[PDB]
Design a protein around this ligand. Structure first.
Ligand SMILES: Nc1ncnc2c1ncn2[C@@H]1O[C@H](COP(=O)(O)OP(=O)(O)OP(=O)(O)O)[C@@H](O)[C@H]1O
Ligand SMILES: Nc1ncnc2c1ncn2[C@@H]1O[C@H](COP(=O)(O)OP(=O)(O)OP(=O)(O)O)[C@@H](O)[C@H]1O
Ligand SMILES: [Mg+2]
Ligand SMILES: [Mg+2]
Lengths: 577, 577
């Protein structure tokens, strides 16, 4: 039951059949030439004298050789290119899947492993396709051709060796099971290794800042050592392919000599036929080696891509309903909305609010309270478990994700960046020609423009891995520029003013309230000093909205967490005193 | 000049010589058996009649076969295990290097690539060792054994084919150069793909939050397509290995027929010796194929590890001077310190300050001013370009890095986390048995303990990749717990209170000023409300300290950036009004 989804996976890409069947045909004609060679070996001794009397024909013979291996070389190319159209289809398929799974999969299942599947797993299926398909084709044809060659010289010994071949099959099966259960462990471990490694190495400042060079070389050596045990053990099982095959030859030989019991009784005359039989039975053993090597390699390749054949079945969702937002100037209403990441624990607990269109509503609350996960709810990364989100009595599930996510800008709490230019990280994802009057206006609105032009100017500047070649404030101002560039109807600032200074905070706040007066902005302030002019506040604590309304009536009406503002009062009051 | 550092790299690990030389010896005795076989093929025809008259000996013959291939199977194991002791030495060497380079290398050279320099390249080194080295050993002997076999039957034709072999060498050399310049491009490109890809995939919230599924699918496809250009082109060059070899056989054949000009003139009698000569010259062509396949594979493997043989030469530095810090309760003095990342641009510009031992000095300044890079200077991640840092008239370069970094707890601006338990990220790097009453004290001092125990309790909790299964405040409180756990003499808080709420800020500030009264804490506050009680302020702007001293005398004495405090006054003053 393992062979059918794997060959459906190979069928799912587009293999070069016009080269693959050509190389198959060349191997067929080559093996038929080698099968005809023991009929021409008796004619060589007079063909040599014919060539010496005739003269030039040996050059034609060289031309035949200059065809044959040369044509056989094309067979190798027509396999190898075909190999590099299967695996470079597989990544071209698998990487089309992986950036379309919903982000619940990437919360569950560590991305630093699932890079390994696109780039390590697909390259283990090279061996089965590049060489062993050749092996099984040539070998399968030879064993049937030499089998009918043994059949025309004897009937019942041919039936006997035909009985011996499924004994080789039934002794080959448990080696195939062991090869499967080793190759799956190998291509699961290599992934945890390209993950205990590429999770460590971006944090080299934390390895060096603690004293953990010796401890982390340790996790690494445990991994190199597990790949060495799960790969020397495969080699051990590979070493049982060699002698066991000889065992069945041993069986067949004793099966012959036992049949040669009544066979010598009828055939002390016909000993030379038995000599020719055991000679061809000595010839048969190398295509059987090719067949069993193909079967071990096929079990290894199925074991590698077993973890990958289920990545291609996980329900991407991107634009199925197609309905456009079409004005997206509506108030966003919540029903009784509840949501948890793990389905046992609820992190939003029957929340309900109304974000009114064209005013600033600010989510204020203590840490761990449910703010960023409410904003992940408000983008439908995640669907709620309870009742849903509407836009003017119309539920959000009817709109397409593509047309609705094109209207919402988001500065998340990490302010993420990717390697490339500053122009690339501002431009990111847009289909327009962003030009450079638009970027200048955007990065001037995010207070970025006065500090990029001291650096070498927006296209030479590379921000490195993870945005490490910029500061902790500069990368947040670039994330604000990314949100402000595409001119959203709804802006969402998951603490966008966290790691800025006070003067840059005032600048970005002035420019953002200038730009976004007529649209809906939802900000999160950890500290209440920047959202006193907000038109609505929502106090979110432990997944429950405990306060709602204008800041003045909320700080008059709320209980204990009025002090959560008042301490901030005291936190500046000493700076008065 | 390429072969010597590669074989010094293989010599630099510890290959299993006691198995490698054993497999070499088994291949030697097997090839000598195959060389003796054309002397025993005339004795088979009477050995068959001796076996029929004697009877049991064929079973002994089977035992010989049950030795030989079985022994040959051990040869395969003694190669393959040896292969998995070279490459699992290489990672065990290379990963010992990579976490010991200074972080200037990881600012220059993009760690996502360097992961596949330890995973996607040592495995390419694999084939040269596992199968092909056998080719050069079996072939190099068969060709010399069959060469002396041709030499005992003729002198000058043997000299002639001995002349033809360096023609094959000089036509093999440019194929080797092309294979080198293709394999280096392959194992440089696969690195940008394991890199581009594993820089994209942690930021799946940014890919989904923008609409960049189509655009980032279009970048991965350019990568799968360039790995297909370095792969359907290498295969093209390996398809030139096949026919070109036949060309030199063509040469040798015509060379024999060239000497056949005076050879048939003296040797129309001795045509049968020429038949045996051309027969063995037909036999010679497959070990030449083994030799040329080994040479192409060796050029490919050198091309892969050329980018890796220079990773092992980059000057790690960790504990060379050995002088342990003693009091560490000394005031940290600066000389004229200047530093820039790129050596043309200066980011610290002749800074000078005195961090006095046992008081709180706070670095306050505008963004991009040089604070976090001053703290990277104050850990000597980076040595300064100008004069250095001292500890009571004694320069910091005399102390060992290991004993001095064990006395400084640094919370970074990103608050980095790694996958594992919350206990693992708090414990990180320590050599003690930590003790749960100590982790409880630490995470209670960082205001973490009241929010971990709502989650499943400090060992079941996994924080996922990059700390994504915790919040933006919880992961910063865990980073503060990591700094507070190992009880440093100097604490360094690169904006440790950034993404917290106000009440948790007050709690962590109260507990930290309770714990660290007698030691040196250096904090960075983007907002001045938390460092008004600091014993010293340093205003850092554009890499120059422009203000220095107590907050009151600084805000009285400084010029324009007194307003940088005063706006914060106004930023709370409206919250009064
Ligand atoms: N996969 C996940 N991603 C994010 N949060 C998760 C996940 N699984 C569980 N959580 C829980 O969700 C909460 C974090 O989301 P939340 O919205 O509370 O952050 P937040 O309120 O923005 O925090 P802060 O305001 O301090 O940044 C935590 O209680 C955490 O335990
Ligand atoms: N490899 C690098 N790593 C960090 N900073 C770099 C690097 N190369 C250059 N820089 C420059 O260093 C400065 C960032 O360090 P700096 O100490 O100023 O950050 P910061 O003052 O902490 O910023 P903020 O206070 O806003 O977080 C920027 O001007 C940046 O251009
Ligand atoms: Mg910084
Ligand atoms: Mg958050």
């Amino acid at each position: 039951s393992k062979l059918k989804p794997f060959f459906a996976l190979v069928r799912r890409t587009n293999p070069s059949y016009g080269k693959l069947a050509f190389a198959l045909a060349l191997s067929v004609v080559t093996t038929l030439v080698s099968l005809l060679i023991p009929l021409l070996t008796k004619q060589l001794v007079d063909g040599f004298s014919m060539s010496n009397l005739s003269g030039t024909q040996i050059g034609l013979i060289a031309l035949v050789f200059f065809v044959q291996a040369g044509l056989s070389a094309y067979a190798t190319y027509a396999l190898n290119y075909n190999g590099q159209k299967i695996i470079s289809g597989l990544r071209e398929l698998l990487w089309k899947k992986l950036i379309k799974l919903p982000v619940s999969y990437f919360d569950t299942n560590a991305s630093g492993e699932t890079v390994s599947r696109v780039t390590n797993d697909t390259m283990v299926v090279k061996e089965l396709i590049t060489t062993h398909i050749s092996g099984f084709i040539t070998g399968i044809i030879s064993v049937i051709g030499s089998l009918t060659i043994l059949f025309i010289m004897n009937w019942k010994l041919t039936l006997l060796v035909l009985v011996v071949v499924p004994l080789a099959a039934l002794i080959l099966v448990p080696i195939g099971r062991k090869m499967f259960s080793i190759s799956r462990e190998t291509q699961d471990e290599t992934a945890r290794f390209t993950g205990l490694l590429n999770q460590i190495l971006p944090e080299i400042r934390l390895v060096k800042a603690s004293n953990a060079e010796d401890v982390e070389y340790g996790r690494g050596k445990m991994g190199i050592s597990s790949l060495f045990k799960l790969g020397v053990r495969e080699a051990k099982v590979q070493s049982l392919v060699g002698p066991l095959i000889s065992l069945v030859l041993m069986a067949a030989l004793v099966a012959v000599i036992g049949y040669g019991g009544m066979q010598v009784s009828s055939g002390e005359l016909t000993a030379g036929a038995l000599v020719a039989f055991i000679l061809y039975l000595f010839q048969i053993i190398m295509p059987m080696g090719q067949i069993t090597t193909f079967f071990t390699q096929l079990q290894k390749s199925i074991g590698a891509t077993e973890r990958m054949i289920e990545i291609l079945a996980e329900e991407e969702e991107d634009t199925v309903t197609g309905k456009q937002i079409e004005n997206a100037h509506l108030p966003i209403q919540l029903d009784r909305v509840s949501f948890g990441y793990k389905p046992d624990q609820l992190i939003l607990k029957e929340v309900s609010a109304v974000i009114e269109a064209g005013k600033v509503t600010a989510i204020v609350g203590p840490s761990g309270g449910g703010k960023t996960t409410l904003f992940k709810l408000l983008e439908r990364f995640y669907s709620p478990t309870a009742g849903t989100i509407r836009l003017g009595d119309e539920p959000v599930d009817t709109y397409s994700l593509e047309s609705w996510r094109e209207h919402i800008g988001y500065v998340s709490q990490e302010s993420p960046l990717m390697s490339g230019t500053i122009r690339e990280n501002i431009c990111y994802g847009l289909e327009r020609d962003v030009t450079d009057a638009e970027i200048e206006k955007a990065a001037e609105m995010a207070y970025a423009l006065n500090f990029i032009k001291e650096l070498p100017n927006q296209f030479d500047t590379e921000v490195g891995e993870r945005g490490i070649m910029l500061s902790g404030g500069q990368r947040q101002r670039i994330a604000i520029a990314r949100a402000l560039l595409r001119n959203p109807s709804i802006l969402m600032l998951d603490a966008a003013t966290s790691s800025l200074d006070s003067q840059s905070e005032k600048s970005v706040q002035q420019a953002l309230e200038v730009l976004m007066e007529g649209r809906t902005t939802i900000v999160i302030a950890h500290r209440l000093s920047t959202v006193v002019d907000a038109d609505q506040l929502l106090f979110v604590e432990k997944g429950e909205i405990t306060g709602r309304g204008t800041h003045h009536e909320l700080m008059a009406s709320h209980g204990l967490y009025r002090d959560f503002a008042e301490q901030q009062l005291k936190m500046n009051a000493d700076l008065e005193n």
